């Protein structure tokens, strides 16, 4: 209407909205992570110390999937590069083990 | 991955979970019920576990959105 | 002077004027000998900048045509808008040097709510630079039958935008300055 | 005879089950191995126990029966003698304050 | 549903356009066709293509589904808004006044009603009165000075240039990234032209020209900004020649433009 | 043995909290001041933008501010729902108590974040302004007449980059062609 013919063939600079968007994307990602974490737990049932090890490996695969969404845009379409991969999953780790908790279904966790 | 395929493979992950559930049933059965405690991780079961992990991987991948 | 130009240009001008939702636009008219015209732009639509580049495009495209500068065949707003505005006033005033025999054109625009097809071609000769309405015989729509026919056609055909402009070239950098093809 | 003496005196009977007391009768010292009653009613009466003393008792699966000590005299002198929600709620108010 | 078309219209509508005659015609057609395959969405969905008749006026089915809603709408001001729209279609100017002003006496929110109110007061071209109205109303309004934008559009159409470029600025501020709107206010001061004009105008103009590396409008825009606004022949050849080298820089990108035009 | 027959109560409580969230959301769901507040927001935003605003524009706005701020200050011269949301904890507590490891309360405290997140797939959950306006506005107008000088300065700094960068702009347009 007003500036009807504006027709922006492109939006403005990267916006904190979409930043938070991709961020929560990573959040639900870590969610799925903790999910697969309890999953592998059940797959082994072990509360064994190797548990947190497989959890590490999981988060590894997580950053690897982040890489799989590469598009060469490491910083470009995804503002930062390193801290993104540094996804601070500590509390969800708790969750993940909590996930592992139900993995106890066989015999495991008491 | 494809989003319809995403929901499908997520369901496939849950299905592998249930397969493993029946498998662990049989395993603990052999162990205690059958009193044959040699019920180590069935190679089939371990392979299914790894496959389900990978299914979850590609699932979340497509689940990026 | 007697001249029969392809008002298909002004036809599409008014077509967009409606299409630009019933919206008034900028429109020109000139040639070495009057054959076509040019809807200038979209609404209140030639800036010091844009009007300047208009004159630029004029010198060039008419140099690209060996043309002769005449003036504006533009589009007002009111349901039967025929009088000019200080904008169109200065338009005709400056164009008085462009050509010898200043005239003016008129048409109704009741399509604010409506979607019309009436042949509105009217002439008001700018005698002494004042748009004195010429004898209503001169205010005529030649082949008003075929005129309104092609009008309703382009309406349904939506070809109101089938033409481009330097303002389209403006409203879109890469766009054509006329869409010089049959559309 | 003190050296072996009867079992009676200022007796009493809490639960003596009219026509039913001696049914499953228990009364003695463990000990002074003998039963004491009087079937005509069951009224505890025994004999033949040494002097000094002993506590005795009467019992059966009936819901009123008891012990009593008896002091026996060489003189034969009859002697004797006798919330989950609460924990949860405490937890809840603190959590509400923390969320606030 | 032809969910392809479903999302397509969700967008088209969402695109907030008005080229709705034939497009929205096909749309409302498909709506009438497969509202079954549509479901809950139609609750307002077809409305989009529907509101085209608002302009267009295939008012039979329009008013028909409209009353379908007016019932489904369990009697709220929004159906009343559609009602003001139809009274417009019905040309029921004073009756639209009745309806709208009444809703006002009931609900004060949708000045879109009052929008149409001033737009009718001046629809035939009574711009001045309804314009002062729109002034006091934007004074009553608080938000999308996009409204105030078009207001000032009318204003500087009456050559109210001062407050016009003022609001142009204010808007672009509210639109911190007002790239094309930078181009706009630029052109506003162009229409003004002048020394302090030149300064602020070419400033925003090139700021976006850079910012919109595709705005060839803005190219010639900031260009003529410097080249004319203060640059009237009394131009100081120190700064004039400086900006003239920059004009040669423009002209270099412009030979390149002619080249990419050959491309 | 009885494992699952008590276990499933976990998921029971899970979807139960889900209902709590969504339902209770519906339940909580179950003008002059506004315009003034909008104006106040605009004024704050205006201060926030300042830097973007050009100095000539800033100065004009500053004149508008000086006339107001003073003018603006002159113009603008129970626990029910909390206890409601809380008591359900106690109700479920007594319930599970009757429904009696402690994994009940454990998973209870546990699941919330993850579940609720995935559950919705989302979170599933006058005078003082006047004085502040005068004070802040007058300080802010000085701060942003400096920002205003910076806004205008942007033009001059931009100028050289734009000048040389015009060929690069032609390149950028051709690339976006």
From Swiss-Prot, chain A:
Keywords: Acetylation, Endoplasmic reticulum, Membrane, Transmembrane, Transmembrane helix
Function of the molecule: Part of the endoplasmic reticulum membrane protein complex (EMC) that enables the energy-independent insertion into endoplasmic reticulum membranes of newly synthesized membrane proteins. Preferentially accommodates proteins with transmembrane domains that are weakly hydrophobic or contain destabilizing features such as charged and aromatic residues. Involved in the cotranslational insertion of multi-pass membrane proteins in which stop-transfer membrane-anchor sequences become ER membrane spanning helices.
GO BP annotations listed: autophagosome assembly; protein insertion into ER membrane by stop-transfer membrane-anchor sequence; tail-anchored membrane protein insertion into ER membrane
Pfam families, A to Z: EMC6 (PF07019)
Transmembrane segments: 29-44, 51-71, 90-106
Cellular compartments annotated: Endoplasmic reticulum membrane
GO cellular component, as recorded: EMC complex; endoplasmic reticulum membrane; membrane; omegasome membrane
Modified residue annotations for N-acetylalanine: 2
UniProt-reported outcome of changing residue 31 to A: No effect on EMC assembly but decreased membrane insertion of hydrophobic transmembrane helices-containing proteins by the EMC
Top-level taxonomic group: Eukaryota
Family: Belongs to the EMC6 family.
Lumenal side: 45-50, 107-110
Organismal lineage: Eukaryota, Metazoa, Chordata, Craniata, Vertebrata
Broad class of where this protein is predominantly found: endoplasmic reticulum
Subunit structure, interactors included: Component of the ER membrane protein complex (EMC).
Entry protein name: ER membrane protein complex subunit 6
Record organism: Homo sapiens
Regions of this protein lying in the Cytoplasmic compartment: 2-28, 72-89
UniProtKB/Swiss-Prot annotation, chain C:
Lineage: superkingdom: Eukaryota
GO biological process, one term: protein insertion into ER membrane by stop-transfer membrane-anchor sequence
Keyword annotations from UniProtKB, A to Z: Endoplasmic reticulum, Membrane
Segment forming the signal sequence: none
PROSITE patterns found in the cross-reference section: MPN (PS50249)
Keyword Endoplasmic reticulum: yes
Xref: InterPro entries: EMC8/9, MPN
Topology class, membrane: Peripheral membrane protein
GO cellular component: cytoplasm; EMC complex; endoplasmic reticulum membrane
Positions of the MPN domain: 3-130
Subcellular location: Endoplasmic reticulum membrane
Family: Belongs to the EMC8/EMC9 family.
Subunit (UniProt): Component of the ER membrane protein complex (EMC). EMC8 and EMC9 are mutually exclusive subunits of the EMC complex.
Function: Part of the endoplasmic reticulum membrane protein complex (EMC) that enables the energy-independent insertion into endoplasmic reticulum membranes of newly synthesized membrane proteins. Preferentially accommodates proteins with transmembrane domains that are weakly hydrophobic or contain destabilizing features such as charged and aromatic residues. Involved in the cotranslational insertion of multi-pass membrane proteins in which stop-transfer membrane-anchor sequences become ER membrane spanning helices.
Name listed for the protein in its UniProt record: ER membrane protein complex subunit 9
UniProtKB/Swiss-Prot annotation, chain D:
Role of this protein: Part of the endoplasmic reticulum membrane protein complex (EMC) that enables the energy-independent insertion into endoplasmic reticulum membranes of newly synthesized membrane proteins. Preferentially accommodates proteins with transmembrane domains that are weakly hydrophobic or contain destabilizing features such as charged and aromatic residues. Involved in the cotranslational insertion of multi-pass membrane proteins in which stop-transfer membrane-anchor sequences become ER membrane spanning helices.
Parent-protein start and end of this portion: 41 to 179 of 242
Lineage top rank: taxon: Eukaryota
Species of the source: Homo sapiens
Transmembrane segments: 83-100
Protein name (database record): Endoplasmic reticulum membrane protein complex subunit 7
Family classification: Belongs to the EMC7 family.
Subunit structure, interactors included: Component of the ER membrane protein complex (EMC).
Lumenal compartment residues: 1-82
Subcellular compartments: Endoplasmic reticulum membrane
Curated annotation (Swiss-Prot), chain F:
Stretches that traverse the bilayer: 5-28, 83-98, 102-120
Effect of residue 21 to A/E: No effect on EMC assembly but decreased membrane insertion of hydrophobic transmembrane helices-containing proteins by the EMC
Compartment(s) where it occurs, according to its Swiss-Prot or TrEMBL record: Endoplasmic reticulum membrane
Coiled-coil stretches noted in the UniProt entry, renumbered to this chain: none
Stretches of the chain found on the membrane's Cytoplasmic side: 29-82, 121-177
Keyword vocabulary terms for this entry: Endoplasmic reticulum, Membrane, Transmembrane, Transmembrane helix
Topology within the bilayer: Multi-pass membrane protein
GO biological process: protein insertion into ER membrane by stop-transfer membrane-anchor sequence; tail-anchored membrane protein insertion into ER membrane
Gene Ontology cellular-component terms listed: EMC complex; endoplasmic reticulum membrane; membrane
InterPro entries: EMC3, EMC3/TMCO1
One Pfam family here: EMC3_TMCO1
Entry function: Part of the endoplasmic reticulum membrane protein complex (EMC) that enables the energy-independent insertion into endoplasmic reticulum membranes of newly synthesized membrane proteins. Preferentially accommodates proteins with transmembrane domains that are weakly hydrophobic or contain destabilizing features such as charged and aromatic residues. Involved in the cotranslational insertion of multi-pass membrane proteins in which stop-transfer membrane-anchor sequences become ER membrane spanning helices.
Complexes and interactors: Component of the ER membrane protein complex (EMC).
Sequence similarity: Belongs to the EMC3 family.
Protein name: ER membrane protein complex subunit 3
Organism phylogeny: Eukaryota, Metazoa, Chordata, Craniata, Vertebrata
Originating gene: EMC3
